[PDB]
Symmetry: C2
Subunit: 393 residues, 2 copies
Amino acid sequence: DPCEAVLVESIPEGLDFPNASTGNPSTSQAWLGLLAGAHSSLDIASFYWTLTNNDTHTQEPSAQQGEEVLRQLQTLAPKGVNVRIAVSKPADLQALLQSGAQVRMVDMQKLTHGVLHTKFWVVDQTHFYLGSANMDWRSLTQVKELGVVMYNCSCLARDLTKIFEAYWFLGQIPWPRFYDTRYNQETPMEICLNGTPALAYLASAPPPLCPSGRTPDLKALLNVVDNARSFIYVAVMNYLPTLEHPHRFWPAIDDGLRRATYERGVKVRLLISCWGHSEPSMRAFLLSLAALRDHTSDIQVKLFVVPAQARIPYARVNHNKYMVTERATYIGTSNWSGNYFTETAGTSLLVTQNGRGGLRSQLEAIFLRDWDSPYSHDLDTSADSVGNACRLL
Amino acid sequence: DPCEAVLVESIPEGLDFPNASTGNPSTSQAWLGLLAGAHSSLDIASFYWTLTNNDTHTQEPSAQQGEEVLRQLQTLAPKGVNVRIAVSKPADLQALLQSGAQVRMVDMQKLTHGVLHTKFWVVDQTHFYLGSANMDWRSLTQVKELGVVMYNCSCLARDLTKIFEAYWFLGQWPRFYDTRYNQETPMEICLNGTPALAYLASAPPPLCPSGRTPDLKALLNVVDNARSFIYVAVMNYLPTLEPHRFWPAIDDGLRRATYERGVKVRLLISCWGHSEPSMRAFLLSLAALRDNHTHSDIQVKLFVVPAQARIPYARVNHNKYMVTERATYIGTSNWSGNYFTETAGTSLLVTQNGRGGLRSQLEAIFLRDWDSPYSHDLDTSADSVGNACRLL
């Protein structure tokens, strides 16, 4: 299969990169194209749905891209597209049900004390999108996001659907052989990504939703961290060494980054996202990694902050959740706190390929332009200078 | 047995505490008393011997206390005291062999890639000293040393002697070495007439027999059983197996306790011209856990002992102990992973309830250390700290 990965970026209106330092399609363009092409199925797992302005209780014109998606979704079911939805149990889903689109609500708080934080699509079981969208107009053009669309990638979409079908069964924890995966950290798929060979595998975040042969998202994340020999670049929304009531400590990712930077000298870059809903206990635990630097080992930590839009609930964050090394890629939907790897649902794509060009270097060039952005500040920037609620910093 | 624990401290000449109110025997006084009382046996585990000035290649008068110890050791063997020594394989030991005192050299670098860094005595299997003071006139009067001498403490001295026996055999486990009194089930001792639970731990797992608690295990259990404070003064704290490795085992216990349980943690590490500057970064990685909501509070201070600089290995605080609201730990290993894996070491842990007693005496020692001018912040100017200072 002639698999092509495109990294597709949701960029907030008014947020831009002046050098065109990585230009690639919008999540809206990718989604509208996926819908317009769709003819058999649109497996779509989301945390919530908030596409319409009225479903937000807002009246912003930028809802239109989501409402177009909604309009197009309203065309999909009478066109015969077998739209099915899994959504976290808390109007648009009733409009879809009236259009004939199936909806199931997942009581993740009953099952495992968490949420269905995954955002992905699987289209004709040939294409897929996986990433930090949120199935709302805000995710499309109000919050910065990264995801991978893998066109013509039928063998990999047909395994991301294995992640969806679990949540679809929950919204109706055992897993039956149907959910198992052969293509994991130990034996990824061989894919001819843009014509250059690559090894690729998909992971799931809470061990109850990892079937046999699925790599746990923490295992894949820690392994990508421990196999690196030159650099580890991470962009993730939230990072906490906790199971975030009563206090627990979660060293698991902290130890992988300490070990890797010390034993192997690996350059570690952590790019973590700040907004008014960021837990303040992050700051001490980020400073506890940034102190491993002078001599001898090098971890550096930076704060991504997306700058009238403040009137919108949950707008203006960088929701992104990926990592890249000299050797591997990791695109995910889980945030980096112990609950996201134990209690909450999440997924990630990992792709390794060698040489220049290709996905790994496109993702690295994305990380580099993020990290060099004005939108990435140091872990001690003056809070008012950050142009947003620097609640953590 | 009417066990009395005295905390005996070597204080460097010219080092003194404004807190006062904490008078105790010098290690010299306690050792000379132990020798003068000794009549059947003296076991001792030692890192190295440097009692005579000539054996130092120095000519400083304060060797006299060690040379008196040496003179007294030279009297012990003709008095009939079964002096036996285990020493780390690298003149005073030849003078002792002339006196009839037995010596064995331990090839720790062959056996486990470390040294015999223990410092302890056992007298008549009835008293013991355990602590940091080396068999070295600089220990007795030029570096600060803490240890416990437990007089009339036959049941516990009779277990420390066994720890030396392990070294004594290396320098030349079966059931002879097995220990009942450990972290799971300490011994009942009537320390100063107030009940206490006490046990001895040893540092490298090859030198821990069955039923001996590993020194790291006992240290981490004390850290994870704390509920109000953890106070720790130790010479070296390296969260690494000092080809680069990682030793977060203590680092995780201190993070976990302060975050999950709100424990106040105090680390009082010791800085000198031979401190590995790698340690500085790892200390800054613990002082980062301070916050208003979480009640996580780790605080870290450096202990530095300010003509004596001409002496090799003088002027350090070589102390190694911890105290909580609940327990004490006096140790001989420093807090780097080699000391718990590769190197020989030993510690006493004592829990007792109420005011007074050993736990509060050791805590009052910690507090007077911590409040000392000799304790500086982890960001202090090394010029103000008044010594060679590789961490600042």
